Design a protein around this motif. Structure first.
Motif, PDB file in Angstrom:
ATOM      1  N   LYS A  56       0.827  -1.200   0.000  1.00  0.00           N
ATOM      2  CA  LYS A  56       0.000   0.000   0.000  1.00  0.00           C
ATOM      3  C   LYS A  56       0.864   1.254   0.000  1.00  0.00           C
ATOM      4  O   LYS A  56       0.628   2.191  -0.776  1.00  0.00           O
ATOM      5  CB  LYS A  56      -0.944  -0.027   1.206  1.00  0.00           C
ATOM      6  CG  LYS A  56      -1.814   1.225   1.378  1.00  0.00           C
ATOM      7  CD  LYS A  56      -2.985   1.225   0.418  1.00  0.00           C
ATOM      8  CE  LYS A  56      -3.947   2.374   0.733  1.00  0.00           C
ATOM      9  NZ  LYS A  56      -5.359   1.889   0.738  1.00  0.00           N
ATOM     10  N   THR A  70      -1.656  -1.217  -6.422  1.00  0.00           N
ATOM     11  CA  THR A  70      -3.113  -1.231  -6.444  1.00  0.00           C
ATOM     12  C   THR A  70      -3.690  -2.599  -6.730  1.00  0.00           C
ATOM     13  O   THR A  70      -4.902  -2.785  -6.566  1.00  0.00           O
ATOM     14  CB  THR A  70      -3.661  -0.272  -7.518  1.00  0.00           C
ATOM     15  OG1 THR A  70      -3.181  -0.687  -8.807  1.00  0.00           O
ATOM     16  CG2 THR A  70      -3.245   1.162  -7.249  1.00  0.00           C
ATOM     17  N   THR A 127      -6.592  -1.686   3.517  1.00  0.00           N
ATOM     18  CA  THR A 127      -6.939  -2.553   2.391  1.00  0.00           C
ATOM     19  C   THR A 127      -8.019  -1.993   1.468  1.00  0.00           C
ATOM     20  O   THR A 127      -8.224  -2.542   0.380  1.00  0.00           O
ATOM     21  CB  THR A 127      -7.334  -3.934   2.910  1.00  0.00           C
ATOM     22  OG1 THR A 127      -8.327  -3.795   3.933  1.00  0.00           O
ATOM     23  CG2 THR A 127      -6.085  -4.631   3.492  1.00  0.00           C
ATOM     24  N   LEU A 165      -8.006  -1.784  -2.603  1.00  0.00           N
ATOM     25  CA  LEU A 165      -7.030  -2.695  -3.199  1.00  0.00           C
ATOM     26  C   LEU A 165      -7.751  -3.747  -4.028  1.00  0.00           C
ATOM     27  O   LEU A 165      -8.742  -4.332  -3.575  1.00  0.00           O
ATOM     28  CB  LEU A 165      -6.196  -3.406  -2.136  1.00  0.00           C
ATOM     29  CG  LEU A 165      -5.144  -2.656  -1.334  1.00  0.00           C
ATOM     30  CD1 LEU A 165      -4.402  -3.695  -0.461  1.00  0.00           C
ATOM     31  CD2 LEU A 165      -4.203  -1.854  -2.232  1.00  0.00           C
TER      32      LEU A 165
END
Ligand SMILES: *[B]([O])([O])[C]([C][C]([C])[C])[N]C(=O)[C]([C]C1=[C][C]=[C][C]=[C]1)[N]C(=O)C1=[C]N=[C][C]=N1
Length: 186
Positions: free
Chosen positions: A141, A146, A166, A169
């Motif tokens: 991250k 991505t 998260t 993502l």
């Protein structure tokens, strides 16, 4: 915040960790047309060297099914490197990463950008769980990744992270290398 902004063919982003936290790194490969061979550099420990040997065997078999006319993995002298050069590295969790880099190199096709992966590969292409998923995901991250590819048996570790880490993502939980192939080479 990483060594490559755009990866060329044969280069794939992997994920590592220590007691201090996670980090990203890149598997680099290159080849020269002269049975092929694989030379490995980057201060790799024995377990990681074996994972490169497994990945090389499996990538050869995978490419033979997917593109039987492509002989690059069977006849070329291939070099694999994991910078930075002085940093010791070990472990089996870059197995998928190495398979992808070899296939990327052999096909002359870069992998999808802003993608990172971690996962041990068995000789038949099964993807096995790895450690450090929490740390690796945080590091992905922070590096602007991505799309992240993780072993399906590490779902619990991913969902131990706070939602703000998260969120959005594109996460792929995989059990077989062929799922990784379709993500890296759409
Ligand atoms: B993976 O977790 O097995 C990974 C493979 C590859 C990307 C280096 N290795 C590591 O994360 C290791 C820790 C380890 C895991 C499993 C078995 C043995 C060791 N980390 C590193 O090698 C490392 C971490 N940060 C910077 C440099 N190297």
């Amino acid at each position: 915040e990483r060594m490559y902004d755009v990866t060329p063919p044969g280069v794939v982003m992997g994920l590592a960790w220590t007691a201090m936290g996670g980090s990203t790194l890149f598997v680099e490969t290159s080849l020269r047309r002269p049975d092929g061979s694989l030379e490995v550099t980057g201060q790799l420990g024995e377990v990681m060297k074996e994972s490169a040997r497994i990945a090389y065997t499996f990538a050869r078999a995978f490419l033979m099914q997917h593109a039987p006319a492509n002989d690059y993995l069977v006849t070329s002298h291939i070099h694999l490197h994991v910078p930075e050069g002085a940093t010791p590295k070990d472990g089996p969790s870059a197995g998928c990463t190495i398979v992808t880099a070899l296939l990327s190199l052999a096909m002359g096709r870069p992998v999808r950008q802003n993608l990172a992966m971690t996962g041990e590969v068995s000789l038949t292409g099964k993807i096995l769980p790895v450690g450090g998923i929490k740390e690796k995901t945080i590091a992905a991250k922070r590096a602007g990744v991505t799309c992240i590819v993780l072993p399906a048996e590490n779902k619990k570790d991913f969902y131990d992270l706070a939602a703000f880490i998260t969120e959005g993502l594109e996460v792929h939980f995989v059990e077989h290398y062929r799922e990784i192939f379709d993500i890296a080479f759409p």
